[PDB]
Every structure is written in structure tokens, then in C-alpha cells.
């Protein structure tokens, strides 16, 4: 019951980029939040957004996101050169089998 996710996206420095994470009624349905995570190349990873509306400390304000029923999406306003990393969308499932299910993963390219 893995979550669907587009392979990768490209963008240019200075303007907004957007990514999406889509699932089904069993995983994202019935009012289940989606969280996001990072993957720096060869570095211990870090959180981006939890609860789909809140935001932790130590993260730039240029990140935002929201969900539309079956799908969810996030936007970065003004991507920079340090955004070269891997992004993960994580949700839960109806049963205890899928307490933690992650997506395949998406990557961004500057310029």
C-alpha cells in the first residue's frame, strides 16, 4: 500500500516549485494527515512539515503545503541552490498494518 509519487521535477532559481503526493481512500482518506521529510545527500535527514499545517523551528518560511481530499501538495517559493535533496511524503493507513507508509520519493533540479 505504498503511496504514489512522481519520480522527479525540475525548476529554476527564483520562482515557485510544486510537488504532489497522491494516494487512495484507505491511506489518505478518513481524515489522515500527511507529513514531509528531507534527504540530504549523505547526511542525516530532517523534517519539513508535520500535521500539514504546522511548521517546526529551524526551517525557512519559503515552504508551504496543503491537501485536497485524495491528494496533497507542497510549494516552495524561491528555491535556492541548497535545495538539492530528496523529499518524502508519509501518511498512515486504516489498519495497524500501515501505521507508517512512505512514498517512493521525489527530487528537484535547479536551473
Amino acid at each position: 500500500s505504498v503511496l504514489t509519487q512522481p519520480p522527479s521535477v525540475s525548476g529554476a532559481p527564483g520562482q515557485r516549485v510544486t510537488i504532489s503526493c497522491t494516494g487512495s481512500s484507505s491511506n489518505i482518506g478518513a481524515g489522515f494527515d500527511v507529513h514531509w521529510y528531507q534527504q540530504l545527500p549523505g547526511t542525516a535527514p530532517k523534517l519539513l512539515i508535520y500535521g500539514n499545517n504546522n511548521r517546526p523551528s529551524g526551517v525557512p518560511d519559503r515552504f508551504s503545503g496543503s491537501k485536497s481530499a485524495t491528494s496533497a501538495s507542497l510549494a516552495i517559493t524561491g528555491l535556492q541552490a541548497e535545495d538539492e535533496a530528496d523529499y518524502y511524503c508519509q501518511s498512515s493507513d486504516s489498519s495497524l498494518s500501515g501505521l507508517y507508509v512512505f512514498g517512493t520519493g521525489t527530487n528537484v533540479i535547479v536551473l
Partner: protein, 49 residues
């Protein structure tokens, strides 16, 4: 008869002492022929109640 009358001497006559009953020979169990498993784990697990 001696046990029923609780004595060692039985007088002339006809007495009732016990009851004869035929015992069953084998057991026959019949149930419907269904195979679907009840989804107990669907309700007994569940993330939120």
C-alpha cells in the same frame, strides 16, 4: 432384585428392578459448508476508535 429389595431373601412374585435403554452407536455433526473468514481483525485492530 436383591439390591432393589435391600434384602438377602426375595419372596414369590414379580418385581420391577431397572430400565433397559438402547445406547447410541455413533455421533453425527452437521454444519453449513461455508469457508469465508469473519473479519474480526478489521474491528479489533483499527488506528482510531
Amino acid at each position: 432384585t436383591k439390591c432393589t429389595l435391600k434384602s438377602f431373601t426375595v419372596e414369590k412374585g414379580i418385581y420391577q428392578t431397572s430400565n433397559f435403554r438402547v445406547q447410541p452407536t455413533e455421533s453425527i455433526v452437521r454444519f453449513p459448508n461455508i469457508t469465508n473468514l469473519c473479519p474480526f481483525g478489521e474491528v479489533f485492530n483499527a488506528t482510531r476508535f
